[PDB]
Amino acid sequence: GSSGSSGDKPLSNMKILTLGKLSRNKDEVKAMIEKLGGKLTGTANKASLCISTKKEVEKMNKKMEEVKEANIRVVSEDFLQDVSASTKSLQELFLAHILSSWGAEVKSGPSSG
């Protein structure tokens, strides 16, 4: 067939990364990030967002490091629950659910918004 496109897709065209343990499961999340139009990834250097927990950002392990390296703002899971049920701007949403202190304009790769 061929039908069903153009809708509320914020993450639409965005690789979201996840770390530690979140309220939902990797799948439940991977689905959302995909439902929003985004896509869950494993690599941080190849991600636009990061959905982790304060604890994680606190751990600052190798995983979280990659995010810190790619200067990727880490937000909470509530973000997904908001991004879907929130008429706020990403930038705001992020800050409205920013778990990390970094994640700003920095040497990035392709793709922009």
Distance, CA of 47 to CA of 111 (rounded, Å): 10
Distances (CA, A) of 40 to 2, 3, 11, 20: 25, 24, 10, 14
Domain boundaries, the chain: 1-113
CB count within 10 Å of CB 102 equals 16
For 49, the enclosing helix (H) or strand (E) is strand 49-51
- Identify the three-state secondary structure at position 38: coil
Method used to obtain the model? NMR
Return the DSSP state at 16.
E
Q: Are 94 and 75 in contact (CB under 8 A)?
A: yes
Q: Look at the domain 1-113 and name its fold.
A: Rossmann fold (3.40.50)
